[PDB]
Amino acid sequence: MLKGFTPWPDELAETYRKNGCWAGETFGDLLRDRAAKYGDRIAITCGNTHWSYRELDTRADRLAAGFQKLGIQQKDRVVVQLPNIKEFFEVIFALFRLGALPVFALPSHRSSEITYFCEFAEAAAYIIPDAYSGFDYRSLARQVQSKLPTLKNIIVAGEAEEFLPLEDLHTEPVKLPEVKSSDVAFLQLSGGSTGLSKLIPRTHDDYIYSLKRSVEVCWLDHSTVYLAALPMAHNYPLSSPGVLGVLYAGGRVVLSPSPSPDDAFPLIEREKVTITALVPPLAMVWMDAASSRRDDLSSLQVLQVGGAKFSAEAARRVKAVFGCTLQQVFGMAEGLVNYTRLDDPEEIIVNTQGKPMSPYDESRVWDDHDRDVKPGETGHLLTRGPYTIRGYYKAEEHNAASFTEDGFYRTGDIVRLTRDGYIVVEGRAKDQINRGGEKVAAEEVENHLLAHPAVHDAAMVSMPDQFLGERSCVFIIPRDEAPKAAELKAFLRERGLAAYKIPDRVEFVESFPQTGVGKVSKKALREAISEKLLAG
């Protein structure tokens, strides 16, 4: 077993195989089978270019031969930081057949974050593009080497310059070592705050299972045309059901150069995408655009919004604005993924974050002392299942703090189970606002503010206060001409918003700092108000 990997228990694992959750097939097996089954069907679409499943299968084998020849071995970690391009697919599946382990970095990561990844994972290779969205990644690669000379295999999809051109790593296919579905297939990146970023070992079995249950819940099939709008390396646009869930269902993937409507809308009309995924901030952007920018988006059947809670005040609009069904997705790269069903009532789709996609997903809402909080009550979320990890990669410390003795992962979210099984997210524990004895949920205030005519978006965060411990500062994005702070505080007051919840402070900005996948980084906003405060 990979060093640093925590196995599932013998009983559970055995039960996961008996109940057919772990199908004993690898990603290499998946692509082989799909290529043999689907042959010339278009698997990936990027611009004016296309790649049939059979073509992917082949390019993957050739790329594997080249990698092996270059020196990459089974169990070797490779840092993969590519944009939404075709190469990404052939690269990971090639690594999959070599038993080599990818480390899914995002195109928004820089020297500090990549160096950590390569160091920590002891990467034997670094795969990047020559340039994307105006950023030169080879220059970033040089910065990495100076700070990490040991790193000797920088592969580049594009103009390699002094590096190793990924395109010449394609050669005559060879026999590769055995790859067990029980082996760790790759390392993901957690999505909390702070930055460190823990790595997440995911096996062929548990991840392929997540894909399967995702396809069934999101109704993917050969007719599915999924638009990859979010950086597809993130767990969400990658498997919930993501680009891979689409491969699994034999559907068709459309690669968008950017999450922007400017790039997405034309592609939705042209390639007739039936589904795509967004995060809250981006959904707002799209909803505005869907109004003052008329183009055919009618083929759209399912719009997914997740990564962070999509406040009901905005969620309610999706149906009217887009003419399709909204689907909230509340998943995590550590495992558990909740979806609103495409079936259930609008009320549910608009007011909940869904329920576990697997009958074998478990949940324990607890209080500050680890007591099964009273049904319906709010509390800390813990989950356990067929595709939720038992330990982060090489991290004894954080693992004690993150997993209970019974194997329950501490998601770090604060939620309340609906008396059926659905979850209604309140917000991350870290984003809770401890204001003078009170526990303030930011999203509640934000959802209210989203109902104001002059508000495009709103993100409330905490600021230090020697008296109350913490205070609240809400960052607002104007729908044009910034309203007066007092005007918003009045708005909330008239809505019946509890006094202690009203934002102590208000800040206007043209946008919010973001995480790699594109959600709002409340750790940055906190740092913003913090810094700004000590200015006086």
Does residue 191 have a known ligand-binding role? yes
Q: List the one residue out of 85, 91, 32 whose CA is nearest residue 62.
A: 91
Residue 496 has which token pair? 């019946």
Give the residues across from 439 on adjacent strands: 434
Residue 36 CB-density burial (10 A; 0-12 exposed, 13-18 middle, 19+ buried): exposed
Determine the distance from the C-alpha atom of residue 315 to the mean position of all C-alpha atoms in its chain, rounded to a whole number: 19
In contact, 362 and 25? CB cutoff 8 Å? no
Q: Say which residue the tokens 């703090």 belong to.
A: 401
Domain 22-179: assigned CATH number: 3.40.50.980
How far, in Å, CA of 100 to CA of 78, rounded? Answer: 7
How far, in Å, CA of 233 to CA of 378, rounded? Answer: 32
How far, in Å, CA of 200 to CA of 421, rounded? Answer: 26
- Cα→Cα distances 497→4, 208, 253, 352, 442, Å: 48, 44, 44, 21, 12
* Domain at 430-536, CATH from 3.30.565.10, 2.40.50.140, 3.40.50.300, 3.30.300.30: 3.30.300.30
Q: Say which residue the tokens 């390019």 belong to.
A: 59
Backbone angles phi, psi at 115, to 5 degrees: -55, -45
In contact, 277 and 301? CB cutoff 8 Å? no
In contact, 245 and 211? CB cutoff 8 Å? yes
SS3 category, 73: coil
Decide whether 22-179 matches 354-429 in CATH topology.
no
Q: Say which residue the tokens 């004993």 belong to.
A: 24
Q: List the one residue out of 131, 126, 125 whose CA is nearest residue 159.
A: 131
Give the residues across from 424 on adjacent strands: 416
Residue type, 210: S
> Cα-Cα-Cα-Cα dihedral of 350, 353, 356, 362, to 10°?
-140
Q: What is the DSSP letter of 501?
A: G
Q: What is the DSSP letter of 429?
A: G
What DSSP line would sit under 221-260, residue for residue?
-TT-EEEE-S-TTSHHHHHSSHHHHHHHTT-EEEE-SSSS
Does residue 235 have a known ligand-binding role? yes
This structure's resolution (Å) is: 2.5
Residues in Cβ contact with 467 at an 8 Å cutoff, skipping those fewer than 6 apart = 436
Does residue 263 have a known ligand-binding role? no
How far, in Å, CA of 520 to CA of 307, rounded? Answer: 9
Residue type, 80: V
* Domain at 180-353, CATH from 2.60.120.10, 3.40.50.980, 1.10.3720.10, 3.30.530.20: 3.40.50.980
- State yes or no: cis peptide before 503, omega within 30 of 0: no
Does residue 407 have a known ligand-binding role? no
SS3 category, 156: strand
First to last CA, the chain: 55
Does residue 351 have a known ligand-binding role? no
How far, in Å, CA of 55 to CA of 275, rounded? Answer: 24
SS3 category, 384: strand
10-18 helix and 204-217 helix, angle to the nearest 10 degrees? 50
485-494 helix and 442-449 helix, angle to the nearest 10 degrees? 100
Does residue 234 have a known ligand-binding role? yes
CATH class of 354-429: mainly beta
In contact, 434 and 462? CB cutoff 8 Å? yes
Q: List the one residue out of 57, 69, 126 whose CA is nearest residue 96.
A: 57
Give the H/E segment covering residue 459: strand 455-465
* DSSP collapsed to 3 states, 327-375: EEEEEECCEEEEECCCCCCHHHHHHCCCEECCCCCEECCECCCCCECCC
Q: What is the DSSP letter of 98?
A: T
- Reported as half-sphere exposure (CB side, CA atoms, 13 A), residue 266 has a value of 9
Backbone angles phi, psi at 530, to 5 degrees: -55, -60
Domain residue ranges in the chain? 22-179, 180-353, 354-429, 430-536
Q: List the one residue out of 116, 103, 72 whose CA is nearest residue 186.
A: 103
Residues in Cβ contact with 529 at an 8 Å cutoff, skipping those fewer than 6 apart = 461, 463, 473, 505, 507
Residues in Cβ contact with 495 at an 8 Å cutoff, skipping those fewer than 6 apart = 448, 451
How far, in Å, CA of 343 to CA of 372, rounded? Answer: 30
What DSSP line would sit under 103-144, residue for residue?
EE--TT--HHHHHHHHHHTT-SEEEEESEETTEEHHHHHHHH
Does residue 428 have a known ligand-binding role? yes
